[PDB]
Structures are given as structure tokens and as C-alpha cells.
Amino acid sequence: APRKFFVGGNWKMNGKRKSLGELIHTLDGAKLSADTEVVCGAPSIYLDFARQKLDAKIGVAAQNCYKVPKGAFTGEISPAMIKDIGAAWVILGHSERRHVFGESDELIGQKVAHALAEGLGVIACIGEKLDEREAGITEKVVFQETKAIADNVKDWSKVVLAYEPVWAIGTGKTATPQQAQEVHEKLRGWLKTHVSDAVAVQSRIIYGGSVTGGNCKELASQHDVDGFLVGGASLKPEFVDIINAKH
Template sequence: MAPRKFFVGGNWKCNGAGDDVKKIVTVLNDAEAPRAPSVKVVVSPPFVFLQQVKGLLRPDFAVAAQNCWVRKGDAFTGEISAEMLVNLQVPWVILGHSERRALLSDQMISLSGKFPRKIVHNLTFVADKVAYALSQGLKVIACIGETLEQREAGTTMEVVAAQTKAIAEKVSDWTNVMLAYESVWAIGTGKVASPAQAEEVHDGLRKWLNTNVTPAVAESIRIIYGGSVNGANCKELAAQPDLDGFLVGGASLKPEFVDIVKSATVKSSSA
């Protein structure tokens, strides 16, 4: 089987204005970054900037939306449908990001006692989003991950397995699915999972997929890491065998994002 292609995603979150967008894109366009087939680079600006970024960005980089609705558009104020993204020729979408799970109704699961009905619904809701986006031809970066409390309780693998299981129950073809493991306790905090901690979860996820989906999916699917990735720690993280790239937050707005993209060479040099 061919090696998994390294992936670096830049999640701009709710950041940017006209001039900021142009500056960020200019840095990316001018960068001497590894090109295909070494690495796939996808940046995810806010919805209002998708067309602008898509029009300005170098052709070997792509764009992603930060979310989309769970079904065809209708009376859902403020939502963006998968069909709209397809119409804009936006190929990728991020779904189930921890900030949406925790802050915007898709809450992180709790393993203390039985699943509350609302939390189970939210697991299914994210999985339904993934399935619908795939049905419309989008490629999905599906986020999973544990909070600090869950890590300290020793339930990390139970949490990420439950989140992945919800997706697996809705998806039969994993060709256009990527898992993004987020150590939620590291997002925006400056903390970061150690390379060993990140590899442990990525390896555990691949073993779960091997047992519960298929060995072929476990071998081929890209599992990327998110959680305060920056130019200083990216190479050591990238060297981990089951880590296939990054979903980068704050650093994707800075010139060091190019250094993170270049960390793909760690994989190619060890191949």
C-alpha cells in the first residue's frame, strides 16, 4: 500500500479581515514549501473569506470550510449547507471541531455513568454531518479528542473510540475521511501533547479501526494531530509513525505555518 500523504490544515477560526487575509495568503504563495506529492496543504478561513482566499491562493494549496449543516439547506438561519460549499467548489470541510462540540452545542462526551441523552445525540449529530457532507462529494476532516478532565481520568481512548464509533456507524466508504485527533486540553493553551502521547492515541485509533472497521481503512486513513502545533515542535511530532500531519490553529495565521508545512520532509526522508 502507498504511504499516507502528509497533510497540513490551517484552521483560521474566527480571525481575519480583508488586509489580514491578503497578508496571510501572500506569505503562503511566496513560501518555498514542499509540493505535491510530498504534502497536501489546506487552509480554512471563515466562510466570508472562502471565495477570496480560493481566488488568491496558489493552485497546489486548497481551501476548507470550518463547518456545514447536517442536511440540505432550508429554514436553518446562520447555517451553511454542503451543497453551497460544493457550488463554491470548496473541496474540504472540518466537522466536529472541539470548539463546536464544547461551545456550540456539539458537546464533548462524558464517561461518568451512563451517557446523557443530549450527549449521545451530539455524538450522532456530528456523525450525521460527516455522512451528509460525504454524500454531497465533500472531503471531511472529522475531529475527535478528549478534555483535560477526561485525560486525567484515564479515559482518553474510550472517549476518542466512542466519537469514532459514532462516525463509523454512519460511514461505509472512508476514502474521503480524515481523522483529526485534538488534545483539547492543548488547544489555545500553549500546552502540547508530547510526541509519545500523540503517537499513543494515533496508534490506538488505528488499532481500533483495524478491529472495528477494516484493516485496509486502518492502514490507509490519515490521522492528523491538533493542539498548539507550532514551528518549534512540528518536526518531532511529524516523526511519529502514526501521525500523518496537523490541523493547526493559531500558528496557521503566522509565517511559521510554512515551517509546519515543511515538517512533511521528516516523513519523506524517513520513507
């Protein structure tokens, strides 16, 4: 019913001890709260710090999770880890991961599944890139991925869908309230039809682009939109600023 407004703060491979501490402190002070779910995610390591310095209110989700409990994979890491330490979420399927590391739909799926099985909140990143939007495969792209996700899935009372349009990410161009509504609406419907009303309904859909001070408001002011994923911007008081979005 709610579709509780959701803000995702993804720190990326940025932030130094100092700056990060700063950011967190700020966020804490930052009364602004509301009926808002704010989830912060930072590099594996900084992870612990994050947990420890931060406060409940802001959930800590990590970018990139690995399927399997334990194993032989120098580099990677298992969710159990963040778990034992203090993280409760995990974002995967990020256009970035998609493009640079070659992760696969199959991978996203397995990931998702393990995480859930293991009690981890999941954040599925689904995305389209200029070139494809163009030939007109938004449909195919998004629809497929979501398929993958749900398929591997096993319930959502802990799941969010974040829609990324790369056709407008550092690729020159202007992404409007509109394109968002449009694509969002559609995903939703796909969702609904393939899974069921309850699911369709309770599952939250957030905007994955350049979300700033003014945009946030602008976008949420939009119907079938329940949240967003901030990067760049997120680095500053912008987060609060943005989070504050509302009708």
C-alpha cells in the same frame, strides 16, 4: 501506503480582508510544496475570497458544515454552498463546536454522511479534555466519537481523522511526541479493528494541538503520525515553516 503528510490550516474567526489576503499571497509564493497535502479553511464568507485568491495546491476546507441540502435554519449553511463557490473540504466535530454550541456525535455523524454523499472531503475532529483523560476516559471519548464518525460514514477515500487532546490546549501542561504517538497508535488500532486493514491503512491521522516551528518536525519525526491541525501559529509564515516538517 503513503499516508501523505497532511497540514490543516484553520483560520477560525480571525483574519481581516488585508491580513488574510497577505497570508494567502505568502502561502502561494511559498515554494515549499512537496508530497504535502495543504488544506486551508476560513469563515464561510471569506471562503470565496480564499478560493479565488488561493491556488489549487492549497485545498480549501471550511470549518463547520451542515447536514441537509437546503432549508430553514437562519445562520447555518449547507455544503452545497461552499461547493458551488469553490471549497472541496469541510472540518467538523471541533472540540470548540463540541463545547460551545453543543453539537452532538449524532450531528457530527449526519454532517459527515451528507458531505460524503455530496462529494465533500471530510475532516472529523475527535477529542479528549484534561478532566476526562484523567479519570482515564481517553479511550471511551475518542473510541466512541470515531465510532460515531465511521458509523455515519460511507467510505474514506476522502476522509481524515484529527486527534485533539484538550488536556493541553490553553489548559497549561506539555503535550509530547509521546502522548501523541500513544493516543494516535491506539485510535489507529481501534480504527483498523472496527473497519478493516485497507481503511485503517489508507485513512490518515493528524495531531490537533499547538503545532509550531520545531514542534512540527519534532512530532512528525514520530511514526504513526501523518499530519496536523494548526490554529494560532498558522497565522504566520509559521504554516510554511511547519508544513515543511519531515523525517
